[PDB]
Symmetry: C3
Subunit: 355 residues, 3 copies
């Protein structure tokens, strides 16, 4: 009984005990810990165990994608080290999540086929640029006390697959053409099992995986760390589903969760992560999730002309917008960046402050 509770407290949330021990151990095993934490940080989670769960999901989805993600995040961490960035930040996985996203989405969008080893070569360079660009953004955004927010990934993944494009002999990408025909959406044709399955599929799309089992694995990883993040994740994916229904989105897109990943990320960040969890904050999170869906439709349409995907551009632009709003209410409380942690610590910090 007490043992199970102690174990639950230990694998929950940022592993403070595990993090304090790691400093002592060997450098390579530390690097592995930082890579795992960064792999979990896409979901705003600082849990190495959730990182192993995430990598299990990625291995389940596609082994080439998992390899690209691993090499991307490890080289992002190494580049953060060689540039002498803050090791508190590297050890918290704040520089590796951009790398894993870069690797995963270059694997996803590459038309060269599975096990195209040359794709590692840009995967390294874009990952090495994940720290640089991150710092370049942090400086601009630290003025308003806003986080970096996956913006580096976006710039890099787009910068790659607009520089190469579909008609590139070395690194071809998938053809993304803008919609030039009216779509006959039939409500009778809609399938509800797939619609309600879009929640895990959206949680999976956060990493680029379209498999529902991978999304369930991701939710398990979230619930190991923070139940608030899990709740806001499901709510964000549901908001994306409903919004896609409301904007006459093609059904196959809602089924594949392409309307959910931006919304889930927005709901995590604007819920517990940067704003103190209050009912006002939770409704702000749902509103930010709805806005984010519009951004996904918009940024998807505006970037389909360039042959580019809309990838996390929507979240950043929504979460940044909702983190910049100034109100006269003391219930929509914006946390300082250093103090920010998983939503439970944020809630405890908020409550102590008020007392």
């Amino acid at each position: 009984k007490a043992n199970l509770i102690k174990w639950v407290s230990f694998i929950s949330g940022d592993m403070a005990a595990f993090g304090e021990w790691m400093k002592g151990q060997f450098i390579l095993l530390q690097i592995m810990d930082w890579v795992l934490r960064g792999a979990a940080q896409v979901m705003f989670v600082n849990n190495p165990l959730s990182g192993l769960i995430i990598f299990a999901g990625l291995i389940l989805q596609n082994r080439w994608w998992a390899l690209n993600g691993f090499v991307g995040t490890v080289f992002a961490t190494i580049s953060a080290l060689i540039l002498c960035q803050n090791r508190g930040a590297i050890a918290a996985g704040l520089y590796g999540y951009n790398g894993i996203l870069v690797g995963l989405l270059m694997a996803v969008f590459s038309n060269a086929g599975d096990w195209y080893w040359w794709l590692l070569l840009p995967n390294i360079f874009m990952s090495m640029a994940c720290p640089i660009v991150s710092s370049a953004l942090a400086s601009i955004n630290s003025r308003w006390d806003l986080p970096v927010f996956t913006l580096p990934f976006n710039i890099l993944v787009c910068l790659h697959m607009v520089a190469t494009g579909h008609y590139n002999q070395y690194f071809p990408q998938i053809l993304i053409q803008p919609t030039t025909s009216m779509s006959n959406l039939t409500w009778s044709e809609l399938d509800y099992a797939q619609l309600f399955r879009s929640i895990p599929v959206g949680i999976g799309q956060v990493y680029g995986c379209d498999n529902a089992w991978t999304g369930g694995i991701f939710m398990i990883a979230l619930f190991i760390s923070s139940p608030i993040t899990f709740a806001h994740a499901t709510i964000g994916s549901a908001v994306g589903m409903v919004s896609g229904l409301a904007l006459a989105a093609p059904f196959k897109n809602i089924y594949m969760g392409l309307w959910g990943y931006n919304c889930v990320l927005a709901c995590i960040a604007i819920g517990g992560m940067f704003y103190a969890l209050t009912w006002q904050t939770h409704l702000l999170a749902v509103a930010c999730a709805f806005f984010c869906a519009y951004l996904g439709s918009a940024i998807g349409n505006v970037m389909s002309n360039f042959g580019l995907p809309a990838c996390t551009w929507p979240f950043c632009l929504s979460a940044l917008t909702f983190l910049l709003i100034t109100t006269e209410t003391k219930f929509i409380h914006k946390l300082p960046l250093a103090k920010v942690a998983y939503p439970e610590q944020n809630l405890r910090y908020y409550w102590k402050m008020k007392k």
Copy 2:
């Protein structure tokens, strides 16, 4: 004699006496006053009477457009209230003009036809987002002491009609395709009555109305409040006309005032409104109006690829550029934002300061 003068002083400029009385009256009538002030604030005018004049013009142009504008501005005001934004700002109509523009231009660009009630549903949401985005912009721009400048509207109206597009089953928009053929502009074909009628048509296009009578109504509303704003309005529309002639613009576009609304807004703001009215400031306003026309040609061409209109993107980007320039002359005086009012108060404040 003295009575007419007193009445003129009272309906002129920000109605200080009317504003001080309103605080006392009932909440709903206050909301109506704030809605009317916001409707007049597109023209940078804080006059409720000019707001009634503007709504008369909108009713004259299209009753569906007027209804969408009214619902948009009322919901922008309500959203500003529920988010606990400054009531000095809401009472000055600084949160409702974006809403009325959103409603009007969604009505204008919707291909679903007149009296498409479902268009109210996005008209509400984009209007509710007018405060949020406004604050999101204000924070960034308050650092340089600049105004939001209708940027929220732009983001929202574009975000809508790039998310939906022409090929959307629920909210179709008009097809805006980029120019793919050379145009044979004939100077002999030019009609001068329509060219010189483009001044009121441009003042109308500020709100989306292409009717010359509506533009005359708008000028009457301006002259009730501030003659300087009226003069700069006519000058801006004329600058847009001349520039459109100078850039080989199609004649039908100049006739319909599509070259004037950005220029008139730029000339109002860079003339009396944010810069103290000096001959140097007035020439800066004319130069900003000319720049703005180039932006309209440019932003129109760059956004026609996305199927989007260029709507007020040009003004903001010009007025912001001309408000950021630093000179060593004390005659190009940039006013602080709180002190800014209608150009007559700005001139009086400037002159007192110098004395």
Copy 3:
């Protein structure tokens, strides 16, 4: 012997002795000096003699292009004077390089043919807007202590040739269509003389000249002022060549140096000019040059949809990114803007500081 050394010291680097004398002489000859310094400032060089060398190269390439460049830079200087901008900045050519680039590239991209005198009319206006926009950018960027970096030129040249476009009756521009066919790049077809000749051709493309002799003239102008700038120039052009090979770029583009001008500018700025010259800084400069090539491929592809060129947008966005990165190493030292001069003075200032 001592005489040759004294002369070398005098035509080297910012001509401090010549600059101090000029203040005394007549206003028109001063204006000529400032125009020449601005013509040399595209290469980050404050040497009037290098300005004469640059204008000799431009006259060699195309006399229409040279005339447009001269009129653009002279009107940029005049506009900087009439707006009462800092004469320390005007006398250093910090306001004329944007003008010469605007004139040169409007001449380059105009489809109206050689000696189209009407092209002078926009060449004047865009040049007159070079100071305004410059100040508009400086204010934003002085907060982070970064330079304007030729961003004004970019905005203006693009703003022109997106406002006019290929199908414009008065100011037609060249057709730039996005790639819609796969290219069969053959390594056997590659010619090495042209590949290695791409270094001077890239240095020429910095000003828009595709002639190798003009590039050699430009390198001579650089070596008169600062050998470090010459070394970083050749290294940047070589990096652009190698990157273009690495991204499957068409061979004719690498031969014409279209992959080098952004890289050479990035390597100059991130090498000696704004960062103190250290081996860490030099590797940062090479990395910034490689990033810049990706930007050129990307910004070229993203802007080819609009019918626009990618012109120096890549450099600014790379140099700005690499100037915003914050590290914990004291060897990547960012110089303050006022202190910045040619790389030799930067190195001497750095070394004195450390002592």
